[PDB]
Design a protein around this ligand. Structure first.
Ligand SMILES: [Mn+2]
Ligand SMILES: [Mn+2]
Length: 294
């Protein structure tokens, strides 16, 4: 029943327009995106094992016209393969269009386009930071619930070519084995502590070395020694995460053993930050494309 091509065409029709212009899909169409993407998310592993070549993006937060920007720099699907690290909704003004385009591409190109869960893909959080209000304002609360059901099935982490470990937040002191991630059962809401919480909420910290307390009031911080041991233990070369704004769009930590990516330029209209996108080529060489704020 679902006309994906037409949905994608209408979402892209506003390319070039000044930021703010809405796209108005029918409720039934959005509901269809959620239900069909949810089938796909559940049919694929919770810990994705992906291969290069690949583009990797961090937080978007409903900045739809920045998402379009990313695709014009990186290549509209299927010209490149994509992995997004979560935080698609909240704070920005066009979360619906952001998430709709992402889900549409996921349905169209399920083997070449991937979405991880971020900490905002949780109903207790996106109720407060804007997605609930955007849904209510534009459609209704029932549609917001349909999105939650779909968010609850997103995968949590990826390993790219057995060398790059990717997740929204970062590491967990509870993470002894990758099998622990593969055993996480979907759908689920994100608990307030534990492994799943930490993957979506933790942060690197330059002033600690081991594990520390996190100023967010949830989860932990980790230092360079945690990072080194994790990579040595699992025979990995790099951790790739998002979750924090970085002035330059990306930022290395711990002698380039971790990188933070952030893909929303001029975040909230408040910050003066650039957005970045990481390319991994077949040789596992990492490059960056930078989108300066306009
Ligand atoms: Mn975020
Ligand atoms: Mn986050």
């Amino acid at each position: 029943k679902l006309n994906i091509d037409s949905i994608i065409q209408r979402l892209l029709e506003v390319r070039g327009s000044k930021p703010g212009k809405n796209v108005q899909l029918q409720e039934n169409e959005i509901r269809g995106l959620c239900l069909k993407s949810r089938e796909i998310f559940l049919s694929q592993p919770i810990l994705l094992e992906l291969e290069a070549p690949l583009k990797i993006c961090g937080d978007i937060h409903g900045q739809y016209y920045d998402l379009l920007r990313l695709f014009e720099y990186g290549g509209f699907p299927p010209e490149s393969n994509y992995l997004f690290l979560g935080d698609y909704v909240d704070r920005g003004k066009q979360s619906l269009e952001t998430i709709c385009l992402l889900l549409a591409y996921k349905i169209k190109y399920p083997e070449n386009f991937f979405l991880l869960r971020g900490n905002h893909e949780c109903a207790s959080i996106n109720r407060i930071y804007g997605f609930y209000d955007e849904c209510k304002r534009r459609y209704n609360i029932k549609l917001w619930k349909t999105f939650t059901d779909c968010f609850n099935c997103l995968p949590i982490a990826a390993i790219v070519d057995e060398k790059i470990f990717c997740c929204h937040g970062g590491l967990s002191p509870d993470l002894q084995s990758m099998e622990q991630i593969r055993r996480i059962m979907r759908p689920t809401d994100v608990p307030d502590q534990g492994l799943l919480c930490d993957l979506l909420w933790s942060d690197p910290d330059k002033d600690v070395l081991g594990w520390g307390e996190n100023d967010r009031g949830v989860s932990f911080t980790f230092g360079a020694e945690v990072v080194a041991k994790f990579l040595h233990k699992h025979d990995l070369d790099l951790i790739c995460r998002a979750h924090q704004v970085v002035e330059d769009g990306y930022e290395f930590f711990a002698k380039r053993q971790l990188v933070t990516l952030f893909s929303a330029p001029n975040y909230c209209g408040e910050f003066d930050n650039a957005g970045a996108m990481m390319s991994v080529d077949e040789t596992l060489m990492c490059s960056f494309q930078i989108l300066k704020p306009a």
